[PDB]
């Protein structure tokens, strides 16, 4: 029984995914068994209307790198019911990454993993390079945080 | 509208910030607080153009769109030497090494 | 509105708001060892950039508007990674 899962409300909710980031965004739908399902990509600056449901669970990642993104300033998005004929906005934004994590991202984007160890950096940093951003990992953390609150 | 700046003179660079509506004079007050030289002993420049104390940073061409936290704009600074003013001189930063092969 | 002075290996002085520099816990530790820190292994093309990161971090953390990307040229990425690692920012 996963901690974090969409509830099968069967109650429709109209949503807009609004990509307010310079990243190509991959939306992920955590299904009824808490498994992430990929939806069509969102190019930077675009918006798309989605027919979702109350109590469904979404998260948003960089489509190329799986770097984490925020949605309405948090990690998870849950549609509620529409009132007054208005869609729920899912405003996807960059977090303020650490400078470290940002450097890691740039290096990962330029260097084939096999070549990480040719870089003239301290060994701990090779390790950090290799510890890729992971949806799975984030779901673990978010699951525990959820239980804590 | 906030503007983010580097006030640069020689091998000194001050990171500071102000409003499009702040004046040039107000920047000299910052400089004075940090470098202990009064406004009348300072000249501030955009490119090589002397800025008047009374103009707003906006009027001088600094918009918040351009003077960003992660890419601040540069204000030149020159100090009075004796009775004359030193020429504006801003020294560049160092050069990165050549790009590693595995990054090409 | 205290400023502190951060000196690069090549002898550039970067003067920044103390509160902005305290984004680095390393720098914080170093400051309560004057208002001056000497970085013998961090050059000006890197440390200038670290300063802009502090500004960016303080400006956008808990913003709730759209956040721009922090730009990093490929030619500085490695040195900047090393500095970020040491400064823990």
CA distance A56 to B27: 52
To 10 degrees, what angle do helices A99-110 and C44-60 make? 120
- Say yes or no for a CB contact (<8 Å) between B103 and A110: yes
Residue B96 lies in a domain: no
C39: left (phi over 0), alpha (psi -120 to 50) or beta: beta
Distance from first CA to last CA of chain B, Å, rounded? Answer: 39
Q: Which domains does chain C have, with CATH numbers?
A: 2-89 (3.30.710.10)
Query: Is A4 within 8 Å of A140 (Cβ atoms)?
Result: no
- Maximum alpha-carbon separation in chain C: 38
Beta-bridge mates of residue A50: A15
For this experimental structure, what is the resolution in angstroms? 2.1
Write down which chains contact chain C via at least 3 CB pairs under 8 A: A, B
The 3-state DSSP class for residue B76 equals strand
Closest by Cβ to C15, choosing from B4, B34, B94: B34
Question: Is B97 a domain residue?
Answer: no
- A91 alpha carbon, distance to own chain's centre: 12
Asked if residue B54 is part of any domain, the answer here is: yes
Note whether residue B37 is domain-resident: yes
DSSP of B65-83: TTSBTTB-EEEEEEEEETT
Q: From residue C48, how far is each of A38, B11, C11, C74, C87 by CA, in Å?
A: 40, 12, 12, 16, 14
Of residues A73, A100, A104, nearest to C64 (C-beta): A73
As a whole number of angstroms, the distance between CA A74 and CA A83 comes to 22
- Given the structure tokens 């509105």, which residue do they identify? C1
Number of structural domains in chain B: 1
Q: Give A92→chain B minimum CA distance, Å.
A: 21
Distance CA C46, CA C20 (A): 17
Beta strand A47-53 pairing with A25-30: unpaired
Tell me if B59 is assigned to some domain. yes
Task: Give me the CATH number covering residue B38.
Answer: 3.10.20.90
Percent helix / strand / coil, chain C, rounded to 5: 45, 15, 40
CB atoms < 10 A from the CB of A42, how many? 22
Distance CA B5, CA B7 (A): 6
Of A17, A110, A24, A6, residue with least CA distance to A66? A24
Domains of chain A, each with CATH number or no CATH:
12-95 (2.60.40.780)
**Cβ neighbours around C76 below 10 Å, total:** 20
Q: Distance between CA atoms of B11 and B30, rounded to whole angstroms? A: 18
Tokens of A76: 């998870």
Q: What is the CA radius of gyration of chain B?
A: 15
Whether B93 is in a domain gets the answer: no
Has residue B104 been placed in a domain?
A: no
Q: How far apart are CA C37 and CA C6, in angstroms?
A: 5
From CA A34, how far away is CA B58, in angstroms rounded? 52
Q: Which of residues 63-82 of C touch A (CB under 8 A)?
A: 64, 66-70, 72, 74, 77-78, 80-82
Tell me, yes or no, if B100 comes closer than 8 A to chain C by beta carbon.
yes
Region for residue C62 given its phi and psi (left: phi exceeds 0; alpha: psi -120 to 50; beta: otherwise): left
**Contact criterion met (CB below 8 Å) for C7 and C41:** no
Q: Which tokens hold the place of C39? A: 């970085």
Residue B77: give the domain boundaries.
2-87
Backbone φ and ψ for B74, nearest 5 degrees, come out as: -105, 130
| Determination technique for this entry | X-ray
Q: How far is Cα A123 from Cα A125, in angstroms, rounded to an integer?
A: 5
* Chain B residues with beta carbon closer than 8 angstroms to that of C77: 103
């Amino acid at each position: 029984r996963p901690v974090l899962r969409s509830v099968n409300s069967r109650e429709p909710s109209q949503v807009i995914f609004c990509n307010r980031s310079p990243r190509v965004v991959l939306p992920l739908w955590l299904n009824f068994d808490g498994e992430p399902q990929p939806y069509p990509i969102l190019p930077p600056g675009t918006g798309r209307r989605i027919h979702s449901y109350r109590g469904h669970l979404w998260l948003f990642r960089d489509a190329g790198t799986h770097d984490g993104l925020l949605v309405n300033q948090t990690e998870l998005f849950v549609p509620s019911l529409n009132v007054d004929g208005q869609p729920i906005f899912a405003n996807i934004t960059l977090p303020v990454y650490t400078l470290k994590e940002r450097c890691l991202q740039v290096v990962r984007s330029l260097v084939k993993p096999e070549n990480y160890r040719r870089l003239d950096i301290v060994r701990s940093l090779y390790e950090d390079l290799e510890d890729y951003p992971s949806v799975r990992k984030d779901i673990q953390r978010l699951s525990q945080e959820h239980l804590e609150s | 509208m906030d503007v983010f700046l580097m006030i640069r003179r020689h091998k000194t660079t001050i990171f500071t910030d102000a409003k499009e509506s702040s004046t040039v004079f107000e920047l000299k007050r910052i400089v004075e607080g940090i470098l202990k030289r009064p406004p009348e002993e300072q000249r501030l420049y955009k490119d090589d153009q002397l800025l008047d104390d009374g103009k707003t940073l906006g009027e001088c061409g600094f918009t918040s769109q351009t003077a960003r936290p992660q890419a601040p704009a540069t204000v030149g600074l020159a100090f009075r030497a004796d009775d004359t003013f030193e020429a504006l001189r801003i020294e560049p930063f160092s050069s990165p090494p050549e790009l590693p092969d595995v990054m090409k | 509105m205290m400023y502190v002075k951060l000196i690069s290996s090549d002898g550039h002085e970067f003067i920044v708001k103390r509160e902005h520099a305290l984004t680095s816990g390393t720098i914080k530790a170093m400051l309560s060892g004057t208002n001056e820190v000497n970085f013998r292994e961090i050059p000006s093309h890197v440390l200038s950039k670290v300063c802009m990161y502090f500004t960016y971090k303080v400006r956008y953390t808990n913003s709730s508007t759209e956040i721009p990307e922090f730009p990093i040229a490929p030619e500085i990425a490695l040195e900047l990674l090393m500095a970020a690692n040491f400064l823990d920012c």
